[PDB]
Symmetry: D5
Subunit: 197 residues, 10 copies
């Protein structure tokens, strides 16, 4: 069963049950057309790096919505395990309330479509996908289990894609808002390389 997630192609469609504001709702990738989506997998509810990452994105959710960007998290756990996790206090590795949908990939179909399913473990690694508003996949970040992801880096990449979507100039290594960009032409490129070093 092959990974269908390819950069510059439509992100593999998905649909399933998620926990949104304490309730079970059906959620579809297509529900986010018009916005940038940060769609990310994490291994297991009731473990360790996993609460911290969901909390880090949830706590800073306004930074994303402020740039027309939603966030959705997902693991192979059921919607009932998600809801129990949410209902466990952060003190006991629970999540406590949260502002980001927790999608359920019980059948493992979505994980396989995104190429993050670990056949020997029965869950995903840490895979994060940045999908733009046309539904096109733009970025893929895959981390071995031990190492969590970074909201700042994710923020930077979304802003970079939105910028380059708007202007057609390109974003140099380390680019942040306000940084120099490059006209992607053999002559126009010299406005950047000549100006700075």
């Amino acid at each position: 069963h092959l990974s269908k997630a390819k950069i510059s192609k439509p992100a593999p469609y998905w649909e399933g049950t998620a926990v949104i504001d304490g309730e079970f709702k059906e959620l579809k990738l297509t529900d986010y057309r018009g916005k940038y989506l940060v769609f990310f997998f994490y291994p297991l509810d009731f473990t360790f790096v996993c609460p911290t990452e969901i909390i880090a994105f949830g706590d800073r959710l306004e930074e994303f919505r402020s740039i027309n960007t939603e966030v959705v998290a997902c693991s192979v756990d059921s919607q009932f395990t998600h809801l129990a996790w949410i209902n466990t206090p952060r003190r006991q590795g629970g999540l406590g309330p949260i502002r980001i949908p927790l999608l359920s990939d019980l059948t493992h179909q979505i994980s396989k479509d995104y190429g993050v399913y670990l056949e020997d473990s029965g869950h995903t690694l840490r895979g994060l996908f940045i999908i733009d508003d046309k539904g096109i996949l733009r970025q893929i970040t895959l981390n071995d289990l031990p190492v969590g992801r970074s909201v700042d880096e994710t923020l930077r990449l979304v802003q970079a894609f939105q910028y380059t979507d708007k202007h057609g100039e390109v974003c140099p290594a380390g680019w942040k808002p306000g940084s120099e960009t490059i006209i992607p032409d053999p002559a126009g490129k010299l406005k950047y390389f000549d100006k700075l070093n």
Copy 2:
């Protein structure tokens, strides 16, 4: 032809001609055993984001070498084109001298083995790979063409993997050195969750 690059498996072997310090030398993935390796692809010599990524890394090479980590870059261009690029002043979108190897992948074999090859274009996307001292692939970062990578994020990741190798603990979202870590078990985990609240 399919990507052989899988997290927690040995990175796909490669060898080829690289420009090292103005000279052609035969470089092998295995020459880096014993050290961490940031192995990264970029589209085309004499383009745009491309020099700025190589420069960014090369110019900060010591922040990697000071943590037992090397950096190698790669494109489908020939070694002759790499050298001419290096021999082009930075002011014209050249690299000027550079301390990180430029590996050449004319046959596209390496790009295909790493699953970064773009069939419709004849070059790669922005693909970065973090390979540990034991040769195991730990992190995969893939960017669509317009958006460059970040030396700082790469550094944070390398540091995180080195930490969790050493202490067998796990790094939460956004972990930078000095940040709180977690002990991977339902019991001992609570010394972090009763501490962050």
Copy 3:
């Protein structure tokens, strides 16, 4: 992927992580050679009929051990979800403590080997298997999700198999301990049919 569970054949081998007396232990089907095992699947932790069944068997576990019979339960949930379920009080649909291993079938491999995996739902139906001490599968009970199983019936079947294992006489409809049995021979059968009605 075909069901390997066939009556009068060795029960499909399994191994995985279970929660035994609050801890993660590796458990193997073979660990129960010498005893009758009641091995049963249930859909999801943090649901409804599922706690009641585990509780019904756990509370009456001594009735099984007293006849050389162990009980193991299993669902597609992780060992971390199991342990959280156990650590949720029975008042909130939790299990509270329990004396029966909760096996984890995260990869779905065991469920598929036993032919209880629901491809569209991502979990099992209510399947119960009675495996004797030689490791041979003797009985299969499969219930659609809404309807729970019965400890009394399970008790009856185990006793019936143990009896018939010992004596070679056969167990008539409705048989319980102390009931009439039948010599499985065209002549010897008449000691039963002649004697009663």
Copy 4:
């Protein structure tokens, strides 16, 4: 040739000759639409557990008919052998007159469609199937040859499915009519768990 019998799918269609009230009649699964059906296989006419199961059910037929439920039995024997069996006094391991149909499966087609056929023996094992009024298969009970089934368990099951059809609630372990039921959702479920404790 594989079993077509799947829980929550329409029971595999069958038809054939049955002895009904001393006569040969053509019986179809579809003749039972509108009623629940206990459809059960047994090994061989003129054997042992076999008459006692048929008698047990037939003699208690009204406990099923009083709840809109029929009972049909089946073996690989011919209709001529079924009738001769019925025409054998119970005192000789016959059935004497019987009110439940004996379906004949000489071609083994039905036994194979239900996955109860024993290739090495040329007859079935003890297989029982509970099919609802809409024709959907709800319960599968398979016994190795020495051990008979239970009318009481069958009755409890039929009653349970009829209840959960009507009230869309779910039946806990051991549910007999009049027992507490559960409302299937993480909220309303607690009116049973805060009640049983």
Copy 5:
């Protein structure tokens, strides 16, 4: 599954349980090596032409034994049905005691091997086979269901094959013991033909 029965080839091997003198004995084709065997199939116990054929051969069995010839009958019925049939008085279409083995072919393998099986009915047609003391198949007689076979004709054939086995002669149309035979060569044949005419 195709007929393995070929004239002048060794008769297809067979074995199974038979009722020999009211007892269940295991019977193999090879047990009859050294004697001629009349091996015949009939459709169903407790039917019509069927008892009369077994009886006809059973009553005249010494005529066969006195020429080193055995007789075995076979149907798809179980050995248990065979025995009940034997224990049924002839006046009710039973067989009463019988000296011919009744072989059971529940699995339908023997019938398929002898190409006498009816897929649409689930039992055999009227097939009879004459197998010599070397186990070579010599004669195949197949009748549609409603016409019974002939003991007289069967005897004549056995005698003729025994005859042509012992002598360098062939048996003309209608040959019975005592009749003119032919020497099978162009010269010797004329001692028969000139004489006859």
Copy 6:
């Protein structure tokens, strides 16, 4: 090339050149619709058992024609050899003039169609087929080469079929015209079995 001759299915169609009344005529199985047909193969013209069988049937043809039955013979010999044999005196092993058609099967298509062809010998064995007036195969008699068939047995068989065709009673072993028949149902079978025999 496998045999198309199945009992109670239409007899494999055939056509070819037959010697009739000294002349070559085209002859077709369908020419015999409305009549019963005894169609039989024999090995080789100018052999031994062969002419006696053709003569036995020819000389007694009226016993067949007076019961709406024809007889046709066939071997792999050419029509010219057939004729040459017919023009050989009976005393030299010829047929002399003959009243039954001799069909020619040089290509072996017909023999192969009837499963009577010997691949190792290049001619048929002794195969006789009884085809009713509706063209349905009713009976197959196959003899190894050394033993001729019987006109008396063939007559009995033809009469038996004609009779069950007409009366829908069935024929017991050894049934000759005027013998007791049986009504084919489990109740009317007692007319024949009680005191009647």
Copy 7:
């Protein structure tokens, strides 16, 4: 099944029963090693051109024996028909006695190996083969049915082939013994073409 007759390749091996001076003898191709063999097929015994050819050859058999050549005729007809045809006076289209073996090919395998079999007719055409003392096929003459072959032409060819075997020189169009030959080289060819011709 394809033809194996290839010029300058070994003639396809054959064996079978033949009529040699009124007797049935097994005959092998390898029996003629050392001698030249004219090997011809004819359509059918008891027909037309076919007798005249065999006689035409058989009468002049001496001219072949005085040049180390043997002859064998073959048809699809049985040995028994062959013998009958010989014992038929020439005046009635028979052969009368004959020195030329008549080989029998009932199975058709020999005709098929020699590419002379007529699938639609069931016998061969007029096919003649010239085989040298070392068993290599040297000549193939195939005639449509209506036209017979020539003893003289066959004699010319056998001689031509014998001459070129010895002298290693080549035979021009229309070569009969004593005629002028040609030396097979572009120098020694002028001896024939120039001054002489």
Copy 8:
């Protein structure tokens, strides 16, 4: 690639360039419809037997035209070699002028269609075909290289085939015009065999 030359079937179609009276003309098999055609292959231009045959035929071409027959020779040689061979004096192994078309088969397809191609030699053997006015193949003569063909035999055959076409009677062995023929039926065959012969 297999031979398509089949007697009594249409001669395989052909076309190509030929040398007809010093000129290059496309030539088709269908060009000879209405006339008999002797069509022969020869190994090579500028060799040995090959010129004598073409001359042998070409000189006597009249005897073929006075019986409605044409002739065409063919080799694997190019038209340019054909023409050069014609413009080579007969005294130097040339043909000198010639009335017989020399067909060219450079591609070898025609030789392969006629089964005369020698795979190991790269040219044909001595193969001759007689084709009637309706384009049906009537005769195939194949010679090994060293032996040439006979104008007289070819003439006998063309006449024989023309006679049997008209009169519908058959030609005995060694038939030249005016000779006694045979009527193709077992009655009218006695006119030839009896009293006359």
Copy 9:
């Protein structure tokens, strides 16, 4: 993937980005319809024989244009490398301004289509192709890496094909404009050959 380049067949279609007069233009084979095209591959920008060949043709380009002939060069290098090569002074192995299109074949499709690709090296050998105004491929010249091509020879060939295109003549060895030509038929050819000698 096999070479599609066949002489006298239409040249394999191609398109891609080329540097035409310092700009990136999209170029198709079909753009040259109506003119002759010299289409040539060279191994690598910034190498050795490579600049000299492009220069040689570039400098003498009017000699081609003045005969309705274009020239295009192609390597596996990117259009960006092409432009930098053009912008590199000839004194450092660059091309300086160039009037010949430089076509880019990054995907290797065009090179594979023209069978000039080296799988082991990742670039082409020295392949040159002459394509006429109808787009038919007329000439293929392939050189191993170390030997350069000849503008003079290339011109002679283009002129010769143009010549033989316009006139019913062929060009002998070494032909240049002005030289003797040959009339390609057996008669007319002699005006050339008798004259020359």
Copy 10:
């Protein structure tokens, strides 16, 4: 049958009959090891461009032999046609006596091995191959039929290869003996490119 001729791999092995010094000799590619070999195919003997190419090379053979080079010619014509052409005066389009071997490829195996065979015409096109002393193919020149090759260009090519073989410098476009060469590295390439040209 695909072409085996690959540049810088060993030249497809070949062997056959060649006309040498008026006589037929067996000739093998390996006979030329140690020498460079110009091996070239031409369409057809007795055509037009063909003799001029053979004559041009033959008459200037010493220019090849004085540089350790041989020349061999080959077409699909037979060795007898080769000879006949050699014995044709140059004034009639013949070769007259000749000093280069004329190889014969009647079976086309050699032409096919070299990818020069025209399936539609049955002869080759104008294909020339330059094989070094180590038997490695160095150069392939293929011309459509109307244009002859050049002895001067072939000489240049042979000299170029001999020179790079010897000096390990590379040959620029139009290199003739005594012209400037280039050292094949990115630094020593400046010796040739600066002021040197």
